[PDB]
Write a protein that binds this ligand. Structure first.
Ligand SMILES: O=C([O-])c1cc(Br)ccc1N[C@H]1CCCNC1
Ligand SMILES: O=C([O-])c1cc(Br)ccc1N[C@H]1CCCNC1
Lengths: 157, 157
């Protein structure tokens, strides 16, 4: 019990509340979730078919992106949310699932389910970087895209 | 200053050392990494093309599975390792990179590289469950396997 360890605990506790708020943001509130980020904050999808992240850079770019997300995922809900604090008061991981309609132009409407890991890094009590990690193959299934198969001959039984 | 907290600090420090040893295990030493697990411990890959985990259940099977892994990935190394402690002294996350030759039956020999998240849960100081999460698209690439391209029409820049 020193004031340095109290600052850290207080930081972790405020940061965790923002992670919880993030993960419970649904419907039209998603249009304001960008306000949880620093001005230069980054969010987006780190696991894509291309092998490069799609990074959305800036609090304002993030609010613009939320209009596209709400259109394409109109009823998205995160479930089975488990929040992991780390040794770093400004860095959290979340393991969860999610489910909802997927409405991408040039594909049929589908139902998308996946398992997700999210990384949340903070600066001054606001999110500086959010990254989502998932298995893009499940998104291919939701879009009617054929999923390649890797054969693992010899893989012990 | 309670011994229930010295109880956990001790568990966490010991477990962290087991995560470090796991993540630095290379070459022939991989044939013995299964000895870091509880008798009933589980390892494997949670992000597959099939959408289901390939879980390797038990110390003995993990030992048998390493023979396959060492053949298919003869020079595998994990790099850029970041270990994350959590509020649970028996739960850790690792973010890292990995690369090496990939040598599968029926595919041209390749070079596989990916970004990985590992989950490690402990029991009595041995690994009770290890799970790897990666982007399966990067492994398709390494095998010469075509990766479909998701189109995100209307996605802002
Ligand atoms: O899933 C995507 O293709 C996607 C890509 C970027 Br770029 C941002 C948000 C995306 N989707 C929402 C809803 C589903 C769960 N992940 C967040
Ligand atoms: O990568 C796989 O296809 C794979 C599948 C299972 Br089942 C166990 C180990 C596997 N590979 C090692 C080496 C490469 C990185 N990941 C762990």
């Amino acid at each position: 019990n020193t004031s340095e360890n109290r600052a850290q605990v207080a930081a972790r506790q405020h940061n965790r509340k923002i992670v919880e708020q993030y993960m419970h943001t649904r419907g039209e509130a998603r249009l304001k979730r960008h306000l949880l980020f620093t001005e230069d904050g980054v969010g987006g999808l780190w696991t894509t078919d291309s092998g490069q992240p799609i990074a959305i850079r800036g609090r304002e770019k993030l609010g613009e992106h939320a209009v596209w997300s709400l259109q394409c995922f109109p009823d998205w809900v995160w479930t089975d949310i488990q929040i992991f604090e780390t040794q770093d008061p400004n860095w959290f991981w979340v393991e969860c699932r999610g489910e909802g309609a997927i409405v991408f132009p040039g594909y049929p409407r589908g139902q998308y389910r996946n398992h997700f890991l999210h990384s949340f890094r903070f600066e001054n009590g606001l999110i500086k970087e959010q990254r989502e990690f998932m298995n893009p193959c499940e998104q291919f299934r939701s879009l009617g895209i054929e999923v390649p198969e890797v054969r693992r001959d010899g893989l012990p039984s």
